[PDB]
Each structure stands twice: as structure tokens, then as C-alpha cells.
Amino acid sequence: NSKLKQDTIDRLTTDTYFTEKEIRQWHKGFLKDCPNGLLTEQGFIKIYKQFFPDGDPSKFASLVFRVFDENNDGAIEFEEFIRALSITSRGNLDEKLHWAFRLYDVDNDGYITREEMYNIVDAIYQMVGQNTPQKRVDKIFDQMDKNHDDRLTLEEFREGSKADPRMVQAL
Amino acid sequence: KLKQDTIDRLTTDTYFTEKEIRQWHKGFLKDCPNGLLTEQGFIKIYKQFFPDGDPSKFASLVFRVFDENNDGAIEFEEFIRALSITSRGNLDEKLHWAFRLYDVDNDGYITREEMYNIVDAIYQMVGTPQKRVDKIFDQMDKNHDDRLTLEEFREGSKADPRMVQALSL
Ligand SMILES: [Ca+2]
Ligand SMILES: [Ca+2]
Ligand SMILES: [Ca+2]
Ligand SMILES: [Ca+2]
Ligand SMILES: [Ca+2]
Ligand SMILES: [Ca+2]
Fold first, then answer.
1. Which residues of A touch B86 (CB under 8 A)?
2. What is the C-alpha separation between B90 and A90, in angstroms, rounded?
3. Nearest Cβ partner of B27 from A94, A95, A168?
4. What's the rounded Cα separation, in Å, for the pair A98 and A96?
5. Coiled-coil regions in this chain (chain A)?
6. For the domain with range B6-90, which CATH number is right: 1.10.238.10, 3.40.50.2300, 1.10.150.120, 3.40.50.450?
């Protein structure tokens, strides 16, 4: 059933930054675009092509699709689409870096490895054209990997990702 | 002067860690022996970020929102609470802070002159100008009374990010 149910709205308004009025209007758009209520991977990548016309965004969009597809059934339902957008577009910085941690930790083992990291950084370079991804990976691990075990925990990744505020740096 | 008393209120109310708070305190004291950051000291900070311009006007407006107690100085606790919001807050929290920045007389409404003043201050730091503002202002201005409530400013900003972003600096 493709109808937005009230029980979906109640969990969404409880967990997300959106109001019911926003959810119901977003839902009419989502339905227009996705008549059976399911956003597919091809459809998702197509959105990334719109945002990034002059690279190949497909690798990165596939990685993001999998994080949006929380129940791993190969589709993004509406509730999934909204939960993800709430965090990324209205979340505080910790909520966003936690979502981003899930993006990198592709096997969900609780760590970002050097390989998982190279893979994201390579996907982003493919999405926008212009020294190597390998050098960026070494640099991130140099600052962020405090116990030198070639992996990043959520705390290391989140705290490393969090810059000192510009004003603090200035002092 | 780091009352552990203070660190607790700070970790409880901000997105900062004890570690972070204790470290940055050291930087604060080095800069302001007093424990008190003055307005012209604050301006110097922005001048590091924006060397081409004159940042005095923007920094002054910002300075007043940091200085929650209206006593003319930014104490460490004021400094970290303002920073927690602008550097780590959610969209609503940032939007509320931007509203205090735009609302220069703190009357709970933003006027069109108030918006001109902040945009002009940005142009001075960073660099027709009214009309642009006049149009955004006019879109946000839902019941058309020529003043923006917070609600009007928030929702207006979920469509018109440019005013808040500008605050970003
Ligand atoms: Ca799914
Ligand atoms: Ca992993
Ligand atoms: Ca590690
Ligand atoms: Ca004060
Ligand atoms: Ca006002
Ligand atoms: Ca109005």
C-alpha cells in the first residue's frame, strides 16, 4: 500500500525534525516520483546525476543509498528517506557525523579501515573531478587514528572530524 | 579559574567535551589574562579571518549576542556556549542564534533596516543591495506587516538559506 499511514507519521514526527505538515507535503512529491512508494537505486543515482552533472556520481550514490536503505531490502521507503534527510539536513554535528560514520563503515563492524576509507574518498573524487586519494587517506589516519591500529572508531572519527571552532583556533 | 563546577554546567549544556573545554580554556587565559574578552579583542579575531576588509561592524554585532549578560565582556562560559551552538548545533538552534544576531534591539522582531544593517556589515568585512534583501525579506514576511517573527524567520530560512549562511562566517 502506497498511502502514507498515520502510524508512520507519528514515528516520524517523534524521531525527526520535521512536522506533520512537512511530512505530508514531502510525501506527495515522493509519490509523484515513486508511484509504488519505493525509491530504487537507479532513481537514487539519478538524483546524484542531477546534482553533479559533470562527474560520475554513481559509486558514491550507491554507497549513500545503502545507508538510506536501513532495512537492507534493496529499496528506500518513505520513512527511510525522511529519517535520513532529517539527520543530514537538520541534525546537530554529532548526529551528522554518526550518520557519516555509518556511511564509511560499510561492513558495520564498528570501525573504519584504511580500505573502507579509501573507497569513500575515491567515490567522492569520481563524483567531482579536481593529490591522490591514497594520500588523503594517510593524512586522515595520521590525524585521526590515535592508537595507531589502522582503524577509526566512532569516537576517533567523530572527534577527529570535529575541528576546533575557528575562534578557538585563533587564540 | 576552571571551576569544575563550571565544566559540569558546560558539558551538560553544550556539545563540548571536558577534554575540549579544559584544553580551550588554556588558550583563553593566554589570550585574556583577565578571563575577560573585550570587544576590540573580539574584533581582532575576525580580522584574522578576514584581513582585506574592516570587520568591526560584523564583529560588534556578533559580540553583543555572545555577551548574554550585557556587561561588555565575553567570559569563557559565554564564549563556549555561543560556540557550541554556531559550530555544533542543529538547524533550529542555529536559526535561533541567527535570529538574535539579526534582531539588533532584541525586541523579538527583525526589521528591514535590521537586515540591511547585518548584510552591510557582512559586505564591509568580506567585500540592488536593498532590493535583494527587500525581496527575501518580503518572502519571509508572511502576514506582510514589515517585521519578522522568529517563526517567520525560521520557516522562511528552510527555503531561503542565504541569510543564515551568511551568518556562518
Ligand atoms: Ca529499505
Ligand atoms: Ca568497517
Ligand atoms: Ca584507531
Ligand atoms: Ca558578559
Ligand atoms: Ca528588532
Ligand atoms: Ca511579518
1. 165
2. 6
3. A168
4. 5
5. none
6. 1.10.238.10
Q: What is the CATH number of domain A93-171?
A: 1.10.238.10
How many angstroms separate the CA atoms of B152 and B33, rounded?
Answer: 42
- Between B83, B86, B90, which is nearest A91 by CB? B90
User: Rounded to a whole number, what is the largest CA-CA distance in chain B?
Assistant: 52
Rounded to whole angstroms, the Cα distance separating B8 from A164 reads: 20
Comparing CA positions, the residue from B76, B65, B87, B92 lying closest to residue B34 is B76
Identify how many contiguous H helices and E strands chain A contains and give both numbers. 10, 2
Instruction: Tell how far the Cα of A156 is from the centroid of ligand 3, in angstroms.
Output: 7
Resolution of this model in Å is: 2.2
B78 among annotated binding-site residues: yes
Residue of A nearest to B93 (CA): A92
Q: Can you tell me which residue has the cell 536501513?
A: A70
Q: b or e along A7-34 (b: 16 or more beta carbons within 10 Å of the residue's beta carbon)? A: ebbeebeeebbbeeebbeebbeebeeeb
- In 10 A of CB B95, how many CB atoms? 21
> Cα–Cα distance between B16 and B97 in angstroms, integer?
17
